[PDB]
Amino acid sequence: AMSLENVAFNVVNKGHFDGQQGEVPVSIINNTVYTKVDGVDVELFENKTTLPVNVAFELWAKRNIKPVPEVKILNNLGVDIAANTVIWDYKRDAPAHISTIGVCSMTDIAKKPTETICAPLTVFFDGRVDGQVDLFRNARNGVLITEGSVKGLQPSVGPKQASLNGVTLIGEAVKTQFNYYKKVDGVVQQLPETYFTQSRNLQEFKPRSQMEIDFLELAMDEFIERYKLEGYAFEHIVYGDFSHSQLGGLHLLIGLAKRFKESPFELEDFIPMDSTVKNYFITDAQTGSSKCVCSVIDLLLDDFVEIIKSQDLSVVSKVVKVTIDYTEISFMLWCKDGHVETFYPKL
Amino acid sequence: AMSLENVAFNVVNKGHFDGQQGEVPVSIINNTVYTKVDGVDVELFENKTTLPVNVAFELWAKRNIKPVPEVKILNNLGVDIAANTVIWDYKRDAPAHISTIGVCSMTDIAKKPTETICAPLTVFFDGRVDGQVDLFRNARNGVLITEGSVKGLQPSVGPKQASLNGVTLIGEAVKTQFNYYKKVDGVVQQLPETYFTQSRNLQEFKPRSQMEIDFLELAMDEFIERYKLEGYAFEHIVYGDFSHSQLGGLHLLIGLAKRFKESPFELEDFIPMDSTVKNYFITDAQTGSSKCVCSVIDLLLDDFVEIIKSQDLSVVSKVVKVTIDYTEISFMLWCKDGHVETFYPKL
Amino acid sequence: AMSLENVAFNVVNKGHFDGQQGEVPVSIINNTVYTKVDGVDVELFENKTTLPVNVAFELWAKRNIKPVPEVKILNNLGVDIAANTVIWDYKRDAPAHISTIGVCSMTDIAKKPTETICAPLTVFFDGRVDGQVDLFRNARNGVLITEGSVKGLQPSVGPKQASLNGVTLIGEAVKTQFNYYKKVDGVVQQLPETYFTQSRNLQEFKPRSQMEIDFLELAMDEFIERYKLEGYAFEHIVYGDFSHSQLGGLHLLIGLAKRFKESPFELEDFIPMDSTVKNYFITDAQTGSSKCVCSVIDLLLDDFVEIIKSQDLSVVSKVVKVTIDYTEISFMLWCKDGHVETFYPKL
Amino acid sequence: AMSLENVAFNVVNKGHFDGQQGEVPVSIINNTVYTKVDGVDVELFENKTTLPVNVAFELWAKRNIKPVPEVKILNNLGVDIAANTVIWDYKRDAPAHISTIGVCSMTDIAKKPTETICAPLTVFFDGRVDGQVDLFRNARNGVLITEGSVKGLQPSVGPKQASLNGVTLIGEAVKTQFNYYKKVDGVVQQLPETYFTQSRNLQEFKPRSQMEIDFLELAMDEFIERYKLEGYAFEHIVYGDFSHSQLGGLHLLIGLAKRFKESPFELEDFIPMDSTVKNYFITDAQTGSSKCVCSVIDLLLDDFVEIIKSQDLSVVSKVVKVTIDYTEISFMLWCKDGHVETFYPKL
Amino acid sequence: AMSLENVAFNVVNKGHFDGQQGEVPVSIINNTVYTKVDGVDVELFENKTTLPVNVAFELWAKRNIKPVPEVKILNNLGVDIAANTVIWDYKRDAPAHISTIGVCSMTDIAKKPTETICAPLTVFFDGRVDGQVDLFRNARNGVLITEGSVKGLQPSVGPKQASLNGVTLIGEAVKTQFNYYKKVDGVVQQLPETYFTQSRNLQEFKPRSQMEIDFLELAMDEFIERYKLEGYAFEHIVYGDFSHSQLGGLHLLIGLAKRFKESPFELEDFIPMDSTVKNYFITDAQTGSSKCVCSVIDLLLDDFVEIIKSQDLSVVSKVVKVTIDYTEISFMLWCKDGHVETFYPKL
Numbered sequence A, B, C, D, E: 001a002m003s004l005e006n007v008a009f010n011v012v013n014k015g016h017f018d019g020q021q022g023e024v025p026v027s028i029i030n031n032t033v034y035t036k037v038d039g040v041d042v043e044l045f046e047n048k049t050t051l052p053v054n055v056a057f058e059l060w061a062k063r064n065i066k067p068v069p070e071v072k073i074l075n076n077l078g079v080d081i082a083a084n085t086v087i088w089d090y091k092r093d094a095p096a097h098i099s100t101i102g103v104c105s106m107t108d109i110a111k112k113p114t115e116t117i118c119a120p121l122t123v124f125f126d127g128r129v130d131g132q133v134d135l136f137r138n139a140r141n142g143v144l145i146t147e148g149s150v151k152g153l154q155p156s157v158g159p160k161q162a163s164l165n166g167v168t169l170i171g172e173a174v175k176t177q178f179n180y181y182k183k184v185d186g187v188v189q190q191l192p193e194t195y196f197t198q199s200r201n202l203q204e205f206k207p208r209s210q211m212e213i214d215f216l217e218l219a220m221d222e223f224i225e226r227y228k229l230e231g232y233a234f235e236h237i238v239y240g241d242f243s244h245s246q247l248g249g250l251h252l253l254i255g256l257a258k259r260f261k262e263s264p265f266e267l268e269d270f271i272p273m274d275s276t277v278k279n280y281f282i283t284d285a286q287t288g289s290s291k292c293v294c295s296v297i298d299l300l301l302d303d304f305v306e307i308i309k310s311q312d313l314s315v316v317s318k319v320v321k322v323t324i325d326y327t328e329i330s331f332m333l334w335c336k337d338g339h340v341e342t343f344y345p346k347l
Helices: A006-016 A054-061 A071-074 A132-138 A208-215 A220-226 A255-261 A301-309 B004-012 B053-061 B072-078 B133-140 B211-219 B220-226 B252-261 B299-309 C004-012 C055-062 C073-077 C132-138 C210-217 C220-226 C254-260 C302-308 D005-014 D053-061 D071-076 D130-140 D210-217 D220-226 D253-262 D301-309 E004-016 E053-061 E071-076 E133-136 E210-217 E220-227 E254-264 E301-309
Strands: A026-028 A034-039 A040-047 A106-108 A122-127 A141-145 A162-164 A167-169 A177-185 A264-267 A277-283 A288-297 A315-324 A327-336 A339-345 B031-039 B042-047 B109-112 B123-126 B141-145 B162-164 B167-170 B179-184 B265-266 B277-283 B290-297 B317-324 B327-336 B339-345 C031-037 C040-046 C108-110 C123-126 C142-146 C162-164 C167-170 C181-185 C266-268 C277-283 C292-297 C317-322 C327-336 C339-345 D032-037 D040-046 D108-109 D123-126 D141-147 D162-164 D167-168 D180-184 D266-268 D277-283 D290-297 D317-324 D327-336 D340-343 E032-037 E038-047 E108-110 E123-126 E142-146 E162-164 E168-170 E180-183 E266-268 E277-284 E290-297 E317-324 E329-335 E339-345
Touching: A006 A034, A006 A040, A006 A054, A026 A277, A034 A054, A034 C220, A034 D005, A122 A132, A132 A141, A177 B042, A208 A220, A208 A255, A208 A301, A220 B167, A220 B277, A264 C108, A288 A339, A288 C004, A315 C292, A327 C339, B004 B053, B004 C292, B031 B053, B042 B053, B123 B133, B211 B252, B211 B299, B252 B290, B265 C327, B290 B339, C004 C031, C004 C040, C004 C302, C031 C055, C055 C266, C055 E339, C073 D130, C123 C132, C132 C142, C210 C220, C210 C254, C210 C302, C254 C292, C292 C339, D005 D040, D005 D053, D005 E290, D032 D053, D032 E071, D040 D053, D123 D130, D210 D220, D210 D253, D210 D301, E004 E038, E032 E053, E038 E053, E123 E133, E133 E142, E133 E180, E210 E220, E210 E254, E254 E290, E290 E339
Parallel strands: A122 A141, B123 B141, C123 C142, D123 D141, E123 E142
Antiparallel strands: A026 A034, A034 A040, A141 A177, A162 A167, A264 A277, A277 A288, A315 A327, A327 A339, B031 B042, B141 B179, B162 B167, B265 B277, B277 B290, B317 B327, B327 B339, C031 C040, C142 C181, C162 C167, C266 C277, C277 C292, C317 C327, C327 C339, D032 D040, D141 D180, D162 D167, D266 D277, D277 D290, D317 D327, D327 D340, E032 E038, E142 E180, E162 E168, E266 E277, E277 E290, E317 E329, E329 E339
């Protein structure tokens, strides 16, 4: 018996819709859902989406609480809709996919994936839920993630980390490494041998390798010498040039954290969402240096070194294509006298 | 005179309504009260309640700024309304009690406590304000707090800390220890000999005793050995089991802080309000372990040890009733082979 | 040319309106501007002003990103409006001046300063932009700032720090020290030999001199004799008296930072706005001490000492006038038996 | 160059978007679009839809102002979307079809009908606009209306009245009778030989035949005898039984108007929209008689008697199926002993 | 003592703001002012303006209830603001002038007309109020209306009708004919010998002369021959041509009413405000004829005849300039073979 008071009952007790029976009073006032707890109103939800408040409330209360891939991966895989589940985009505070399959009639573009309108739609299937693997087999456009091995299909390993309740993490108690399949027009795709982004934060930056701890601890020279980066312009690409007003370089998150620890600054996310490469509005509180738009990518420093060493230094200026998180990211390399000048990621 | 421009004048000058005469321009746009300071609009208030914006504004501006008991204590004492004052619930951003006595006609359920409508309602009387003790004597259902002794009444000591402008604290410059009287049906009631909660935070966790220093510093085995907590399952009850996906145990705030200092995690308050026992949505950022609903109580570790000692270890499954903050909290003791297994607080 | 979709295109790409050509879909829902990025809606803006959402969006997107004087300085200089630019007030999240000149027809009180409506209004001219100096010369009431020297005008040095994108800073890569001119009624005035506010914040406090580092490290008494402050009541005017409930003294930011680093407390800003003097609602979480309204000025401790050593120090009660940030601020000195008793800034 | 100030310029001058170049200030406040005419704000629009205000504004300003079929006819024909035009539903004050083709990117599922997403959707093509007939020929699912004859296709005549700017009418100066085609899965269908609804109103009911003027002027018995309606239950079916509390019969609009002229009553449209058959909440102000659900259809009285004569009087109870406005409307014929009990449009 | 509860008290009792002292509870929810009458809330006001709800409430409650000139006359006279009063614009349902003098500080651009900001602004002075005539004499830019004669000033006679609480009327009990003065730049101007607009509406049209009753009753040919406008084309200019789709002529209100009485139609006011000339979106429900923009003026038919007979028939095409309601209205005349063809008012 779908309703709203049942959903609020579930949210009050369990914190998410776990399909229990019961009803509680609800008041809706200005995009906000209140409930009466011992004679007083407690805010249960606050709509930030563009959907109606009760629609968004139901979508949130029915969100996924198991470790699921980060929304940027699903974007790159071209996932249009998630079958029998809701993916919540904690960065946007809004559901990741506009319609649903098998979730709620107020939003279901189709009750089941097999409806004709769902043929063009690239769906997402969760292997861990019983009955989705065969559905992915039968589905024309689809993406499946399985915990382990599925018979007759060659997997692609995903990133070491997934998102569990809006925090990304590498799981010990849980497995956050899925195997990614993909069908287009009914024929199983071959996913590229891609790199991944680590999805780290400045505030909680933890190095993930020895080169990274070296970067964090050693000065510019010590590090560049030890890892033989003489002709590769880390002092601009990764360390950033704060001498002039227009802040230069600084297109890797590790360099951001390195300058942050010595002197914190401010990053303005003017497009709050999840991408492989992100643009910020950087201002440096120490030097007074700033740049309007700063493409920033977060690879493993090890992998960034691997990518830049895989390049041809002789050419002055070409546009590189790098597969990151299942998509090609156009890098733009400039070399002076055959040694690397700049390697900004293309806008 | 009771107006809105007078209230805004008081708020602009003093920060709260201190009953002075003056007028100030006011603008109201979307649950928000603006005032014009030197030709530009400054936000004076923003309504988070369900009341009309000007009603809530007046209630906030007339809130109590002397140290007053935290709202959970009043809830446990069944206080319906507070006489001649407004209690503000900074956890909830809304006034604690729906109606008033002697505050303002737009909300006053009755001008004086002696009205017939106020007979069935438990009121709150503040001893520190002159004239409230006689009112409490005359009132049928009532709760009174005085700084010291009132003639002919047997007190009950309250918690060592009160709330002063929305931050709880133990007062040196000010007395935050009140004596709690209470009468029902006109007959003075005998309050139980209860324990109290300390109302601490993870971000600013301050140990209040030597056992707490030991817990924070000593490892699991050292602390358990020193305080002889062998058959008492602290390694699950208070330390938490993060090996499996479903995070286990961890129903004391001290254990939360101990786990937090090692690897910080994030807690979801899906019912923002003040209660003796609070339920959170816990996910562990290191292990990837999580639990949908996890009751958490903050006692003195000394007092938790005392109450777990004062139990019968033989029974397998028992429902324990403990009087905390003037209310009985059902604890669910499980013993394996006659020694403690689990002691989760009941839902 | 002007539109809303062009503005949103510029904001999506550059983060501010940089005058590019192109259009992007936009959705306006409850004081909020959304745009559709790869099939999903992303919040580009959220109106906090009292203006219409699209008006405020345009004003924000066209805000100034070069280092500009902090709005308090413009307030003190009586700047009514800024010519050919928008000054954004990040403290208020609203534009600093109600109308514009040469910005947008929906707001321009006049297209150019020379209109008769703009005659009675003090305008702000930016020397760094080509064509504003002659405009200031022709202007009747106006204020000009130049990086360097302008022929035939005697400058006044501004503060060492300006505001670049809402963070105040002393600029190395960029010049954040301007020279301030002012014409009233067509005659250039002589700006007073004033002192300046350092514009520092409590949480991330940085001493700017030797006396300040001494204050931060040395205890009370030691600092007092080293700088010979025996008869100058630094026990009250700076260090603050927390023995009684009525929190005493503490009217300089440095003393607040001193008290904070040892025991943090909460400052309640009831008038979010930038002024030279600011009033707070201080409560001390350690002692339980509080005061309703606490005027707090931020000086150089060096300069506060230089002020207090220039006083009569003999009379009981006089109200002195100090020229800070181009305005006279009444300090209220009390001396008992010819030694400083109190020196609170007048309300 | 798509914009919003251009649209408002067009609306201010022409009253609808007629593709002119020019711009006008706009203010958006609470679902309402204001513009400044000689220094004061005039409301240009007020959103009643569920769409964002600017989206709905653009859809309204680009609505169709030629005589177009009433939305109920399109509903019956299964029209999903209208190609290169916007149909406005003046009953609902909202656009008739959720998405658009070739109108604006904020709603276009596809710029042109030939897209694969537009394959499974029945589109509407307007013959009067040059280039739509060939598009209908090439379209998988489609509906076309032409003023006259299209080569190689056999038409179906539509209703003698269309809707021009939200008032339905039979056109003398303009041709409001179209010929209706239809392709399902690429094959042209044969539209049924159907009856039509007259789409009239009580407050301005005009008879459209001789039988109707007879009904309006003649008494009950005179009309029944003249047209030989002795055994056909017009007394209950078309005249209404107001003797009892539950208002009986009265399922044709002409009977409503006949009772209205004598003693006016009030009809409650609890589902404001356009359908062939409509349900009202009738209460009779004279007798005090009322009925909760009163299906009301507006046929030609001539056509209604033709349909009722085409029935079988012997059957006690069958469910007739009548094709009205290109859809089958089930009728409940109860006929006892050869005399009709009550026709009753099935619900 | 300005406030909001006092204003609501006045509105509840007197219906507008006299100035009685007394205060009443008020609730504000979504642009709406409620008050509690005998335990239930009653809507006292509903904001349609762009001002804050309480600002608009005070402006409305303090509106003028004496007969005052219609806002279009003030627009033509260039009145910027009204001194010591509020003119309410019932067409727009919003105050007529953005700022005030002597009304309330939230809107007072200046307390008195003599301030410097009020110098460049044409003000409106009400002769009937004691003290406004001397102010008008002293005023630099201003407009006065006296009920009779003022010493040393030559008046201009205004229209026979004024507006009394939002209905225009010719007054018997009250005198609604004022004498209009005007001092541009401190020098009294000479107002033109202008024609006037009758300000009538279709629903309650009333002829004001013999020619008008003739028009209403006489057919086309009878009227034209009796008043001998053979070569003047009333059959297009005034009677309207409904044969073709694009409605023709019909630019006088009397012609609208004459067509209305025969077969009523619908007029769309897409710019709701008051002007001498008004543009409508007209569609004819009988013929199906319509025009996108249909300028309509409402003179006395007597006066329209006088203006058209004051023309030069020989010219093929000129632009006539006619003074109506103190402004020049560019009429546009076409003559074919030396006799009048068309006389549309120019846009």
